[PDB]
Structure 1
């Protein structure tokens, strides 16, 4: 019904493209790139969208008198006329109106701290059906106005900016108060057998596509982290239910647990992750065996205490095993009597790290791919690579058991091959003594210096 501070939301707008509605959500990575963009969510049945970086938390909802009061120095329902502070779940930065552009438009993206007016947004009713001081209702079209620049949060042409043109937004709830201890969608977690479900380590002959039960240290590495993704956008953070279908996304690689005709149980690119290949559910038992709600729903599955059998929804097949303990994970008609898994929730530091490794690997791989492109040939995400490097250098800065996080964060990245990755950039740039752009070459010495600085920061201590 209503929205409250601390609810988690997405900011959705629509565009009409090829005479069909396309729904899109405000997204940003934060590290490596502060700028918002739009993540299409309409084709979810075929291609699951990247939702982790669309989630925002309603930190704060103030009257403007209450805002001006604070600027010159609790599950509150949101009222029209209030100013809101939206913290990005992944990066923990705040949604702001930036002071850069590309005329009258400002960039929208993420600000590293909630000081000043740029990260505040007033909410206005999009019809006479709502008035200042009334509660914002889940479902309401609304207008969002930057407190700092007085422009409207705006969809352009698909991009987002702050503009004098209005755009209608739906602030759609992802979740509200959940029952302590209960599994919800959007959680990052591990699945333990009796040893946990994972894909192999970086640079494996695997190509990282096969699934395993493995024990030992993997139980604390990023490669065994998974994100649960119900087949819905709104209330995708609701409590999970026995038999409810969901996709299971591998965090550091972005691939989706799947049944595949040629190869059996594997992990699959998002573009191949259609519903049937990719829907599993949790079952109480292997016996033969509703209508999805518009709230948190009944809590059903508990971290630690619940035993769960994972079933592939379209085939009915059971997640099981085949054969420094490492077993291959398979889908089978019968499985084994000890197939039930238990779930353990990841904590935020490690969860964040795993997403950062995903983006970083993507970015530097693309940057390596551009270098290979003109390697043989006399005649690149320079901006992002630089910011990414600068961001990681700050993240790895030495400090007071901050030394523990550091060592552990360094460890997560190292076990995901970030050292080779950084080394590969250095080796490829050092093929040159002093091809690319001349524009590109303006940034060469800066980037190699930043890489070496990162390298050192990944080993220090």
Structure 2
């Protein structure tokens, strides 16, 4: 594609010079637990895969000044310079916006729950005389993005040492690189969260707190087919057009969603799942093959692999080894494999997909909090700063996430919303969310009062002690409620 249309998935990219070299950074936010945007390095993708899932936005709308201002009193259209755009985060379903807070004493840029104000609208402007107002925005174009609410530039900040995003009066050139646009119905694209079925049996890692360390891969049947631990994100070795149609033989990384780890071949362990910082191309590159015989684009490309209907052998690219079972059976990489090695893929729906990523971030955050709690116990203090603010917001968000529907609503909708809530509760429960909440409750209850906590933690950290235990108990209730 040459032009950006509405309903396209894009990433906002900028550049920085770090140690005499260009570093490409994408705009990222988690949403839940943390609204603030940050920058995800994408340059070192060959060695360390970037956390791309939270970098994706969709172009919801592109309005003229008159259309925007007029609609504020209350299909795939091309982007034109001078248009105001609405960017919806794919994961959190929140909207990229200019926030009313600041970290510098400029404005913070983050995610907003609702696209209701001026704050979630951004006008696009030409970076040179090569483009003009009312002209189509082209793929590859450098853009200036102006906050409609504050009249400020989407800015890359370099103070101090760290690379950050804010809304500043200084300008920054941005590229809206397309991830995907207009997919063929029923076809596998990159960035899709899915399950790999065998023959029923699906590919997975073990349950939380297993003696596995959650690092081995298995073919497992029964209930695991509906649990988060069997979900994987397909990640092509590219950033632009990463959401393009997946092709036979095309190399890709296979990411485990709840754990954030990468299917890999290792020298000593063989087929395992590996940390991002050890997920280099050779160890971590796989492709789908039509058969076991010998054997780039700037668009969606040709649609090749169908959901459910396509049978795919998985092959490790660098080694040529086939994804197979040892003979719940363990997954291995073998020179020959087995005649029934072919897998079919099934797309994960967004409720489950979102839940799985939510658990990933929740686990990461609460384990960080637990590790900080363990570090100063019992070491009376100058106290390894605790993520208080994020823990609070994470808790508050998860509580609203698990909130039962209002009894005032009708019967038909009530039963439908209940069925979703239970399913959401189930996914978290099966991923060891209860233990996680309990471990925070238990480690905090080691202290009698806030002042007792203040003896080991910060006096300032203690100001939130009661609120956190209260919220943790509240979440516990919300997780258990039927």
Structure 1 distance, partners of 2:388, 2:417, is 31
- Secondary structure at 2:78 match in 1: coil
**SS of alignment partner, residue 238 of structure 2:** coil
Q: For residue 370 of structure 1, report the CA deviation from its aligned partner.
A: 0.2
- After superposition, the C-alpha distances for 1:332-370 in whole angstroms (9 at most, x for unaligned) are 000000000000000000000000000000000000000
Matches within 5 A, 1:53-64: 53-64=54-65
Call closer, same or farther: CA 1:124–1:339 in 2, change over 3 Å: same
Query: Aligned partners of 2:46 and 2:400: how far apart in 1?
Result: 39
- After superposition, give the CA deviation of every residue in 1:386-439 in whole Å (9 maximum; x if it has no partner): 000000000000014111011000000000000000000000000000000000
Provide the C-alpha distance between the structure 2 equivalents of 1:245 and 1:103, rounded to a whole number of angstroms: 43
Map Cα deviations across residues 311-334 of structure 1 (whole Å, 9 max, x no partner): 0000000000012xx000000000
Give the Cα separation in 1 of the matches to 2:156 and 2:236: 27
Q: CA RMSD in A?
A: 0.6
Shift of 1:104: 7.3
Residue 322 of structure 2 corresponds to residue 318 of structure 1: yes
Deviations 1:229-252 (A, max 9, x none): 000000000000000000000000
Native 8 Å contact 1:33 1:387 kept in 2: yes
Q: Which moved more, 1:10-19 or 1:95-104?
A: 95-104
The TM-score with structure 1 as length reference comes to 0.99
Q: 1:346 to 1:103 in 2, by over 3 A?
A: closer
Instruction: Give the Cα–Cα distance (whole angstroms) in 1 for the partners of residues 478 and 222 of structure 2.
Output: 27
Find the residue that maps to 1:401 and give its secondary structure: helix
In 1, the alpha carbon distance for the partners of 2:104 and 2:314 equals: 54
How far apart in 1 are the matches of 2:42 and 2:178? 15
* TM-superposition CA deviations, 1:173-201 (whole Å, max 9, x none): 00000110000000000000001000000
- 2:377 aligned residue: 375
In structure 2, relative to structure 1, the CA distance for the partners of 1:185 and 1:19 (3 Å cut) is same
Contact kept in structure 2, 1:199 and 1:212, CA below 8 Å: yes
- Partner Cα distance (1:444, 1:141) in 2: 47
In the TM superposition, what is the alpha-carbon distance from 1:376 to its structure 2 partner? Answer: 1.8
What CA deviation, in whole Å up to 9, does each residue of 1:23-59 have, x standing for no partner?
A: 0000000000000000000000000000000000000
Deviation of 1:108 after TM superposition, in Å, equals 0.1
Is the contact between residue 104 and residue 164 of structure 1 (CA under 8 Å) also seen in structure 2? no
Q: Secondary structure at the match of 2:194?
A: strand
Using the alignment, how far apart are the partners of 2:105 and 2:264 within structure 1?
47
> 1:104–1:163: 8 Å Cα contact kept in structure 2?
no
Measure, in 2, the Cα distance between the counterparts of 1:429 and 1:405.
Answer: 32
C-alpha contact 1:260 1:266 (8 A) present in aligned 2: yes
Q: In 2, distance between residues paired with 1:402 and 1:361?
A: 25
Contact 1:374 1:436 in 2 (8 A): yes
Displacement of 1:103 in angstroms is 6.5
| Aligned residue runs from structure 1 range 35-434, under 5 A | 35-102=36-103, 105-157=106-158, 158-194=163-199, 195-289=201-295, 292-323=296-327, 326-379=328-381, 380-399=386-405, 400-434=415-449
Structure 1: where are the runs of 5+ without partners?
none
Cα distance between partner residues in 2 of 1:31 and 1:427? 24
1:127, distance to aligned residue in structure 2 (A): 0.2
Q: Is the 8 A contact 1:10 1:56 kept in 2?
A: yes
CA separation in 1, counterparts of 2:79 and 2:205? 43
Residues 104 and 424 of structure 1: CA distance in aligned 2, closer, same or farther (over 3 Å) = closer
**2:364, 2:429 → 1: CA distance?**
16
Q: Write the distance in 2 (CA, Å) between the matches of 1:383 and 1:23.
A: 29
Decide whether aligned partners of structure 1 residues 90 and 103 sit closer, same or farther in structure 2, where only a CA change above 3 A counts. closer
Q: Secondary structure at the match of 2:149?
A: coil
Q: Secondary structure at the match of 2:108?
A: strand
Q: Tell me, in whole angstroms, the C-alpha distance in 2 between the residues paired with 1:340 and 1:411.
A: 30
Cα gap change, 1:47/1:285 in structure 2, threshold over 3 Å: closer, same or farther?
Answer: same
Please give the alpha-carbon distance, in whole angstroms, between the structure 2 residues aligned to 1:94 and 1:363.
22
User: How far does residue 74 in structure 1 lie from its aligned partner after superposition?
Assistant: 1.0
Separation in structure 2 between the aligned mates of residue 303 and residue 388 of structure 1, nearest angstrom: 34
> Post-superposition shift, 1:73?
1.3
Moved over 4 A (4+): none
